[PDB]
Amino acid sequence: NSDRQGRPSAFVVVSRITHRHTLINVLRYRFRVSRFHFLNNSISGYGPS
Amino acid sequence: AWVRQATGARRTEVLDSEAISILTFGRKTDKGGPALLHGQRATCEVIL
Amino acid sequence: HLPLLTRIRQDYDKLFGFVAARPDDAVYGDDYVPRVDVFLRGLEDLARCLCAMRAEEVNR
Amino acid sequence: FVREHMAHATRRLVHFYQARIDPPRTANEAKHDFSTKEFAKVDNYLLF
Amino acid sequence: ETTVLVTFEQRLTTGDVGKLSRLIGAVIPIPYRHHLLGSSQVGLDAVVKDKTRDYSRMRARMREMTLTIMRRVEGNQMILGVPTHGQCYTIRNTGPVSWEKGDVLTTLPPVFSGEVTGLVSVSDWDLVLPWIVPMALATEINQRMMMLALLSLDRSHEEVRAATAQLRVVRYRDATLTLPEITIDDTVLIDMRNVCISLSMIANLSSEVTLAYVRKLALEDSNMLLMKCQEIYNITPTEELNKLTALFVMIRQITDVISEQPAFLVCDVSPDDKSALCIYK
Amino acid sequence: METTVLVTFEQRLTTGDVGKLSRLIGAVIPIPYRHHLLGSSQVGLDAVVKDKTRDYSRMRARMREMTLTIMRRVEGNQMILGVPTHGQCYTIRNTGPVSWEKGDVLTTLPPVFSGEVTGLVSVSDWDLVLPWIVPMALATEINQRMMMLALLSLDRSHEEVRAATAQLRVVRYRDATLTLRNVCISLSMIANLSSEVTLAYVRKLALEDSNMLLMKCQEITPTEELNKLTALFVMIRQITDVISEQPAFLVCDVSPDDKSALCIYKG
After folding, report:
1. Fewest CB within 10 angstroms: C17, E51, F80, F138, which?
2. F213:A40 CB<8 A
3. Do F213 and C13 touch (CB under 8 A)?
């Protein structure tokens, strides 16, 4: 959002899912609020990433 | 918006990423609604 | 107006990215004046959900 | 709520209709369209 | 549980159990992971006979399967030891790829060049085994599913079929398999989006040194990679560190889109090229 | 107890050289392929460090094929090795330039001769050049410095770009400072071609947006169309082969003098 890392949010996630990208897809459900902000600083800062 | 408001308010709890999964594995979406004095209930439909 | 239309169309695209996550056309239509009157309230309903802006800004 | 600070609603009347907005029908005009069977069902969002 | 004793529950033959007696060490997936299972669950075939039956739903399904290794096939008892993560296990070849010692293997749904009888269609039920491919054929066959799904976005109705047939005869090591007549399905589409988003961000992070590197190299060098890719300043390195690193977040993700689960890593291959000592589930 | 690999000393190991091998009892050993007998010419990484045109990543593509193995004991004419069981603890020897600390993930990398050129117990051109068991976050760091030096290697003719390289090979970690091509072609094919091919694919996908992320993604011949995307994805495969550094250990605790550390073996 503003402060070069955000307020780095931690999670202990349990799931029956073993596989990798099928597990990050259920995170692609949860984290759009952070993911749309992840796209934001890609254009809010040019040079800084 | 209007049809699902007209009946059946619930649209999705899952993604499109998991919407194929409910087609793949039949998942039990609706819970036991708490209004259960009789017990198990059924229905189906054929248009005449 | 192309410049005004280009800048509303850019910003009509950009606000609904925020709104769907929660962290019209012919700018000349007679009907466009109640289209603004609804869409001002469409923004007043979205500025109400995100009630936090300079005085000269409101003067500009 | 609004008193409108009544001066002459003979002329103030269509000054509203100049704008082509309508307020939502607010819980009684939206209640009359429910019928006797319709009211008691789960479809009635105005049971509260 | 680890050791899985299996009920056959069908009417098998002597010609059945003779095949598995030479197949001891094959890979069988089980969904439930009991000690006692039946052959309705044991085996992969029971889901490849679905009615939609595309590679998009079979690949995403069987990553919830649990793989086992065929042991002690005498008569009607199937010992299936569930492997543990990181012990050495030998595996008999189920698909004709020689597995090329030293590399990572994966799980391929089914041959899908027709419907192969994995053992014998016993009572109209065969026991079909997954292909265990060396992750290059796995990533490539998953690449082309999205290659030809990106193709069908901007084609009308025939230059799909004139270019899928260009790309479906996958000539790999010992195998020329076939893309399964690519069906546009939404599990591809949710992930074809994030690929197109991952291609977008690399364009953002390409900070005009990573960009112009080939286009500066063609002026100086004459290389095979450099000529085939012709057709196809700033004093801020610390910022170029972070942009290249964020670029490396994307390419470790967009590969992970089309790559599969790392699985059995080859210890040794026999000169018969059939039984392969492998570690690392 | 465990797996065993015997090494037949084709070269005569002097008792003083055995005195140096009997100091490296914990150290890792790069083996080319799992087999019970191997030559001393097989054992070690010197067969990888040897070509007029051999690049850092190509050696790393070879070492990724080489099986990591751990020294067990040196009995005179033989070296006894153990291929480590995954998940077990192993006392490996910190022969890298970096002090290890309790909880860190260790990654094997080929030793770089940039300011720290090193050999071993050498006789007849065979030494036992030993891979840098380096922490994983520094292993990705070392990789990124090598590519960015090579991406800037063509523009030596600018001194300011050369001054950008002059900062660049300075690698500084905990208690350690050290100095440090088709892979950079692979970086540039992804950088240029994704800039051009995504525009006809963002504007088509951006209408329907389930995660609500294609909206600011827009803010960010069919034969030749696929030919770009084929040689897009295959170059993405080529760089990810030489990025994902396949982590090798997890140091639980470090022995004092930082010579050794008990390391539970991972991957």
Report:
1. E51
2. no
3. no
CA of F218 to nearest chain C CA: how many angstroms apart?
Answer: 10
E49, E181 contact by CB (below 8 A):
no
State the number of CA atoms in the 13 A half-sphere of D31 facing the CB: 7
Q: Which residue has the tokens 């189920």?
A: E94
Neighbours of chain E (3+ CB pairs under 8 A): A, B, F
Helix and strand element counts for chain B (H, E):
2, 0
* Residue F255 backbone phi and psi in degrees, to 5: -65, 145
Using the structure block, give the residue that is written with the tokens 């950079």: F184
Asked if C20 and F209 come within 8 Å (Cβ–Cβ), the reply is yes
Cα within 13 Å of Cα(E112), Cβ side: 23
**Residue E178 β-bridge partners:** E169
Position C30, amino acid: D
- Partner D contacted by C29 (CB < 8 A): no
The DSSP bridge pattern shows strands E66-74 and F249-254 to be unpaired
Contact list in A for residue C21 (CB cut-off 8 A) is: 32-33, 36
F263 closest CA partner among F129, F138, F110, F136: F136
The neighbour count for residue F84, using CB atoms within 10 Å, is 24
Distance from CA of B21 to the nearest CA of A (A): 11
Q: Do the chains contact at E186 and B21, CB–CB below 8 Å? A: no
Residue E180: both structure tokens together = 């399964």
Residue B26, chain E, CB below 8 Å: the answer is: no
Cβ-based contacts of A40 with chain F (< 8 Å): 216
Chain-chain contact of C14 with F216 (C-beta, under 8 angstroms): yes
Of the candidates E154, E208, E150, E156, the one whose C-alpha atom is nearest the C-alpha of residue E182 is: E150
CB atoms < 10 A from the CB of E62, how many?
A: 21
Q: What is the rounded CA–CA span in Å between residue E221 and residue E223? A: 6
Query: In the complex, which subunits touch D with 3 or more CB pairs below 8 angstroms?
Result: C
C-alpha torsion A26→A32→A38→A43, nearest 10: 140
The DSSP line for chain E is: --EEEEE--S---HHHHHHHHS-TT-EEEESS--SEEETTTSSSHHHHT-SS--HHHHHHHGGGSEEEEEEEEETTEEEEEPPPTT--EEEE--SS----SSSB---B----SS---SS--TTS---PPPB---SHHHHHHHHHHHHHHHHTTS--SSTTHHHHHHHSEEEETTEEEE-------HHHHHHHHHHHHHHHHHHHH--SSSSTHHHHHTTT---HHHHHHHH-----HHHHHHHHHHHHHHHHHHHHHH------EEEEE-TTSSEEEEE--
- Determine which of E144, E202, E219 to mutate to test the interface with F (most F C-beta atoms within 10 Å): E202
Q: How close E190 gets to chain B, by Cα (Å)?
A: 6
Q: Which two tokens stand for residue E101?
A: 């010692």
CA distance A26 to chain C (A): 16
Task: Annotate E225-262 with b (16+ C-beta within 10 A) or e (fewer).
Answer: beeebeebeeeebeebbebbebbbebbbbbbebbbbbb
Residue of A nearest to B17 (CA): A25
**Contact between B17 and E187 using a beta-carbon 8 Å cutoff:** yes
